[PDB]
Design a protein around this ligand. Structure first.
Ligand SMILES: C[C@H](O)[C@H](N)C(=O)NP(=O)(O)OC[C@@H]1C[C@H](O)[C@H](n2cnc3c(N)ncnc32)O1
Ligand SMILES: C[C@H](O)[C@H](N)C(=O)NP(=O)(O)OC[C@@H]1C[C@H](O)[C@H](n2cnc3c(N)ncnc32)O1
Ligand SMILES: [Zn+2]
Ligand SMILES: [Zn+2]
Lengths: 399, 400
């Protein structure tokens, strides 16, 4: 269970003073930040912008989207100077405002606009569960503005990017669902027939078996849902592709087409990891806290046996820190066996131990959180191989 | 003016439906993210944790800080299930909540806890000005939890860090202020005297000339303010160092002393850049949009003369992109001087012109946004000198 592992590894905490809100401690914020770096490596490759929308906008804008009439109960509101404001439950409206700045043509499409966008949703407190269902979360979110003609390739690109990103983490059970029109929605039936059909088609062309969830899509679009399973095999919506012919209309999005007329862009919404919070929860149970090195909060701990090797440990720690390895020295006045056990429990991938023979040889005794003892290794060989394991984001280790 | 250059460079925009709230466009968000990376390099060096606290906490917690009394008006509130939440105007209470998990000892201190902490403050709409005074901003915030013995060293560390980071931007007019007790405050006069004196001694010991700014401290502590000046030479508080003996106690912070007694830590507050929003407005006007290469949204633009050299531009654009450079191709059907003028308005450091002489030669013609021509040079030489000017965060271009 991530909530117990999350306690043990000092990843995050939660309190009653903020229900469904995460306090990311150093170590879990490091995992979060590493998933950001990972996501942006993939954004760049698939050519996305990255923006940041504000945290609140006038409730008039949310009335415009139908979010007011279709989603009122889920939204936090505040106010200033007789004006009411919604804290954003979603990033899409604010990407649309960004898109509406500057005249756009068919030559700007597809325009792929991402954001690590902090959403707040007034989820019933009875529904809240760990990191999986929270009131405040950051989606690895994006809206793609495109033509009707570009839908197929754009939705296929989102699907590809889900299986690409997920293979880094080695998930066995990825169950896909198509969530179709809810009772309370925007857009005509015809728009919903086209959007439901385009996503089912996308799934069949990508060879993805899927199950309907009838009535379960958003008010503004049907969803492809990439469903991951926690250690009690509960199903959690993670990766998410939706198709929307209504929102950009409602927010006066337009572009100048080839024929030189005003057209309304189609909008694809996706989140690949879903939310960082839920994805981290899933990974934590997926790995049972044994995060791959690239994700591990602390990758290496260097311990002296006695005071005598402490300066060697500090030099080595600096040297690894400079190679870009998340390393800590543990120079505490404790028995080595007590320090090894501490960091093993914290699931530090590599423990380097320095006695006088390590000092004399300029080597280091290496062991893992799995209890593997790799013996004495050249220091530059330890750095070189760690950087290989980190750069390639390897699923498992030096053995 | 940063708001004009802001729009010219497509950095950000603001809208009546979110007064004082920034929409960061790709290009302005690139600057922001580059400053984050810079600050992270300094956090790592100066040994800070990086955490993230939530946007909302119960109003009961904010009443404990003395914030309901003292920071009443600036706070945004919201509701859920008959409970009232304050959107955080400050990152400090949330840092303390993290500190209060687990048992702490004097061996944990000084505990430096940084955060890029999104604050919302309901500033009067008449007071709002561009990126400089906003209702929603992100501080390069941290709270240091320390003993009374460690205060001199930790306050000195924060001052060192300010001048360390500000020297990257090459700032000349850093006016320092000591902002003293406001009318509405928490803490005893003794705690204020000690706080104000300790900050004054830190400055004095570092040979920093300053001036008192009477009544300008926060309700929870006095401030060293590192003041920077915009185009109209108006003063903006950026770097901020505060000493706080009151909040830790109100929020039940303690650690096991060496004496084995329970002890309340001292809390140092500092923001080095201040807010990212304000710093970016300051830098924009300071450089008049000529961001150093490391900061520039687009660092390089590669343009053809004729339709001929399109393919060459496109591979060079790929190669520079692979080499970690923010690069665009400009293959529009326009004469060279037209394109150079446009990318100079966009403040693009380097403009790589490609005619058939550059295609044959495996070379490029380097012009700069300062109207200067650095002639032709091997592509790999340009890439290496760019990466060096990016890695070093150099203020100066090739020549300039
Ligand atoms: C993406 C697109 O742009 C669109 N706008 C959108 O928002 N879609 P949707 O509402 O399907 O969310 C997508 C993902 C699913 C994942 O589960 C996470 N998520 C949601 N509520 C969550 C909670 N309460 N706790 C944690 N994660 C949560 O966001
Ligand atoms: C830092 C410490 O931890 C403490 N908690 C704290 O908050 N200090 P303080 O209240 O001095 O603010 C620090 C900086 C100064 C800079 O000016 C920026 N800032 C403030 N209001 C701003 C606005 N409205 N727009 C933009 N930046 C703003 O934050
Ligand atoms: Zn969306
Ligand atoms: Zn503070």
């Amino acid at each position: 269970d991530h909530r117990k592992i999350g306690k043990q590894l000092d990843l995050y905490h939660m309190q009653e003073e903020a229900p469904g809100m995460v306090f990311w401690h150093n170590d879990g914020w490091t995992i979060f930040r590493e998933l950001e770096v990972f996501v942006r490596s993939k954004l760049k490759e698939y050519q996305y912008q990255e923006v940041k929308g504000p945290f609140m906008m006038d409730r008039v804008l949310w009335e415009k989207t139908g979010h007011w009439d279709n989603y009122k109960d889920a939204m936090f509101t505040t106010s200033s100077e007789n004006r009411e404001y919604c804290i954003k439950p979603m990033n899409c409206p604010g990407h649309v405002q960004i898109f509406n700045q500057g005249l756009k043509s068919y030559r700007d499409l597809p325009l792929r606009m991402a954001e690590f966008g902090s959403c707040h949703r007034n989820e019933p407190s009875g529904s809240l569960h760990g990191l999986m269902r929270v009131r405040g979360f950051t989606q690895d979110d994006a809206h793609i503005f495109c033509t009707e003609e570009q839908i197929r390739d754009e939705v296929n690109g989102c699907i590809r990017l889900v299986y690409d990103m997920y293979s880094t983490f080695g998930f066995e059970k990825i169950v896909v669902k198509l969530s179709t029109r809810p009772e309370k929605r925007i857009g005509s039936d015809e728009m919903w027939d086209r959007a439901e059909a385009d996503l089912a088609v996308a799934l069949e062309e990508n060879n993805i078996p899927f199950e309907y969830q009838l009535g379960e899509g958003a008010f503004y679009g049907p969803k492809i849902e990439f469903t991951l399973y926690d250690c009690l095999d509960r199903a959690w919506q993670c990766g998410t592709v939706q198709l929307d012919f209504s929102l950009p209309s409602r927010l006066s999005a337009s572009y100048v087409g080839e024929d030189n007329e005003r057209k309304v862009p189609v909008m694809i919404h996706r989140a690949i990891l879903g939310s960082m919070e839920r994805f981290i929860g899933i990974l934590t149970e997926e790995f049972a806290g044994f995060f791959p090195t690239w994700l591990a909060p602390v990758q290496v701990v260097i311990m002296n046996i006695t005071d005598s090797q402490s300066e060697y440990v500090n030099e080595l720690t600096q040297k690894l820190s400079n190679a870009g390895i998340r390393v800590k020295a543990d120079l505490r006045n404790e028995k080595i066996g007590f320090k090894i056990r501490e960091h093993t429990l914290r699931r530090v991938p590599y423990m380097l131990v320095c006695g006088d023979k390590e000092v004399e040889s300029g080597k280091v005794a290496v062991r893992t959180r799995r209890g593997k003892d790799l013996g004495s290794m050249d220091v530059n060989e330890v750095i070189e191989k760690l950087q290989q394991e980190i750069r390639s984001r390897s699923l498992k280790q030096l053995e």
